[PDB]
Design a protein around this ligand. Structure first.
Ligand code: CU
Ligand code: YT3
Length: 96
């Protein structure tokens, strides 16, 4: 099972807008089977891509279609690990 070890931006942090979201899991994950929702102040934000760029597949990069406006963001993820298993979670962060 892939558990979220950390993310950038971090849960409950306030940051200047990043270029992408980066979730690091306890196990490798599969970008084709994994799903991620992003919302700002309760409104869906468009995701152009998912990818795991590294050989170990532990960091999932979530690329928004456009630059991230200031606001309160919620991330919902449903992961499929290289070990086949499902996991899911949520966290929130702020773009100042
Ligand atoms: Cu498992
Ligand atoms: Y929609």
């Amino acid at each position: 099972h892939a558990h979220l070890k950390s993310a950038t931006p971090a849960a409950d942090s306030t940051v200047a807008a990043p270029a992408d979201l980066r979730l690091t899991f306890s196990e490798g994950v599969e970008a084709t089977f994994t799903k991620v929702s992003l919302s700002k102040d309760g409104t869906e934000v468009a995701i152009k891509g998912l990818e795991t760029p590294d050989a170990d597949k532990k960091t999932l990069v979530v690329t928004p279609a456009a630059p991230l406006a200031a606001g309160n963001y919620k991330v919902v993820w449903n992961a499929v690990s290289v070990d086949t298993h499902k996991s899911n979670g949520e966290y929130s962060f702020k773009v100042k």
